[PDB]
């Protein structure tokens, strides 16, 4: 019976990326062919069958997107239609029912309006993290798709991921670990993929690597992605007489096993249609990694994680000399995404879904 955090007392500057109990979440339940009307729920728990399919047989997928208080005082969700469609794709891959795009967008507006006082104010660099979830809740023993599903959407304010500037990190390649089967569910944002990566995480954390890069499980010769973020590389950077970048190539792996990052898609669209440079979505052999001039990971919580080095066995590929250093194009991407998200750069590609609050 725990109480909501008082929004008027939240020190936004101390926020990191943690669970925080806001006023409400929204809920809908599927049975007999239809979702029930969306409802606000104040208590951050629900009653689940001890036999729920989500707990025994893994029918559980989720999403992640951000809502922002913009420079002119409005509220916008960043590309939520992309999340609604990926949620449907994750559900389908696990034989789960899913809310339609419109039900998803209705849930978002409903939950954002009821928790509007939890959106970190403009100037904090914070945001409202949105976590949609679909889980099989029917009680069953045989291994089969559940007959009942629940769609939840919860929110929590998070602080600026980079309080005080972009920082680069060291990555390790997991040679004795896979994150996805070649013909598996690596492209679905499903619960099981994350627990299946925890053992590799602890091995990498014990060696002081905050991020783990995976190669393709089939041959272990091509870059796949990090455990919770896509991989990209930058090369062929060319500049004019003023030092301005006038050309470069953004490279990112292509594979049915890779989670299709919406931030990655955003970066590709910025590289080619906003800045007018080259984008390559193709197989990235690991031997090519040493030819990249910049390397990064991409995902909603970080936008980008600049990669200072990649370690595989005893071979080290060094991109940046210090964690203070970050790739120039990588930083440009970060600032351009954030400029659009917060309303400072005009939203040329209509990525911002404004919510009337």
Cα–Cα distance measured from residue 169 to residue 323, given in angstroms and rounded to the nearest whole number? 6
Cβ neighbours of residue 184 closer than 8 Å, sequence gap 6 or more: 257
Interface mask (CB under 5 A) for Mg ion, residues 111-130, using x and -? --------------------
Q: How would you classify the pairing of strands 211-215 and 169-173?
A: parallel
Asked whether the beta carbons of 339 and 345 are under 8 A apart, the reply is yes
Between 141 and 242, CB nearer to a second copy = 141
Which burial class, exposed, middle or buried, applies to 8 when counting CB atoms under 10 A from its CB (0-12, 13-18, 19+)?
Answer: exposed
- 133 near a second copy (CB under 8 A): yes
- 158 near a second copy (CB under 8 A): yes
- 182 near a second copy (CB under 8 A): yes
- Coil, helix or strand at residue 109: helix
103 binds, among Cl ion, Mg ion, a second copy, none (CB under 5 to 8 A by kind): Cl ion
Report phi then psi at 9, rounded to 5: -115, 10
- Coil, helix or strand at residue 124: coil
Among 29, 38, 196, 279, indicate the residue that binds a second copy (CB under 8 A).
Answer: 196
Q: At what angle do helices 262-269 and 80-93 cross, to 10 degrees?
A: 130
Complete DSSP assignment for 61-80:
EE--EEEEE-TTS-EEEESH
Between 35 and 78, CB nearer to Cl ion = 35
Between 183 and 349, CB nearer to a second copy = 183
CB of 27 to a second copy, least distance (A): 8
Residue 18, number of CB atoms within 10 A of its CB: 10
The residues with which 317 forms a beta bridge, in sequence order, are 310
Cα–Cα distance measured from residue 230 to residue 258, given in angstroms and rounded to the nearest whole number? 8
Between 166 and 174, CB nearer to a second copy = 174
CB of 36 to Cl ion, least distance (A): 10
With CB under 5 A, what is the number of residues at the site for Cl ion?
3
Between 131 and 312, CB nearer to a second copy = 131
Interface mask (CB under 8 A) for a second copy, residues 12-41, using x and -? -----xxx-----x----------------
Of 247, 261, 187, 191, give the one whose Cα is nearest residue 217: 187
Among 18, 100, 221, 238, indicate the residue that binds Cl ion (CB under 5 A).
Answer: 100
- 58 near a second copy (CB under 8 A): yes
| 272 in a labelled binding site | no
- 29 near Cl ion (CB under 5 A): no
Residue 159, number of CB atoms within 10 A of its CB: 20
The residues of the shown chain that bind a second copy, judged by CB under 8 A, are: 17-19, 25, 44-51, 54-60, 62, 93-96, 129, 131, 133, 135-136, 139-145, 152, 154, 156, 158, 176-185, 190-199, 201-202, 217-218, 227-228
The residues of the shown chain that bind Mg ion, judged by CB under 5 A, are: 98
The residues of the shown chain that bind Cl ion, judged by CB under 5 A, are: 35, 100, 103
């Amino acid at each position: 019976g725990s109480m909501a955090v008082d929004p008027s007392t939240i020190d936004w500057s101390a926020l990191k990326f943690s669970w925080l109990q806001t006023r409400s979440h929204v809920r809908s339940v599927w049975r007999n062919g239809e979702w029930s009307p969306l409802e606000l729920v104040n208590e951050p728990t629900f009653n689940i069958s001890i036999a729920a399919s989500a707990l025994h047989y893994g029918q559980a997928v989720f999403e992640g997107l951000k809502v922002f208080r913009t420079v002119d005082g409005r509220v916008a969700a960043f590309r939520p239609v992309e999340n609604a469609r990926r949620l449907i794709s994750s559900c389908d891959g696990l034989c789960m029912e899913s809310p339609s795009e419109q039900l998803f967008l209705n849930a978002l507006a409903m939950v954002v309006r009821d928790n509007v006082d939890y959106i970190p104010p403009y100037g904090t660099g914070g945001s409202l993290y949105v976590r949609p979830l679909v889980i099989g809740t029917g009680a069953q023993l045989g291994v089969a798709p559940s007959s009942e599903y629940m769609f939840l959407m919860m929110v929590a304010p998070v602080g600026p991921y980079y309080r005080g500037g972009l920082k680069s990190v060291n990555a390790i390649v997991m040679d004795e670990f896979d994150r996805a089967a070649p013909y598996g569910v690596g492209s679905k944002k499903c619960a099981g993929n994350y627990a299946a990566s925890l053992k590799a995480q602890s091995v990498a954390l014990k060696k002081s690597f905050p991020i783990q890069l995976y190669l393709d499980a089939a041959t272990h010769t091509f870059v796949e992605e990090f455990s919770t973020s896509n991989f990209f590389g930058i090369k062929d950077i060319q500049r004019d007489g003023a030092g301005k970048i006038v050309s470069c190539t953004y490279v990112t792996p292509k594979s049915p096993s890779i989670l299709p990052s919406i931030t990655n898609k955003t970066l590709r669209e910025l590289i080619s249609q906003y800045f007018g440079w080259k984008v390559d979505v193709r197989e990235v052999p690991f031997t090519e990694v040493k030819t990249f001039q910049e390397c990064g990971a991409t995902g909603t919580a970080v936008v980008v994680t600049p990669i200072a080095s990649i370690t595989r066995g005893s071979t080290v590929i060094d991109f940046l000399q210090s964690d203070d250093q970050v790739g120039e194009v990588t930083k440009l991407l970060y600032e351009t995404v954030q400029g659009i998200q917060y309303g400072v750069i005009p939203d040329r590609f209509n990525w911002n879904h404004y919510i009337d609050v």
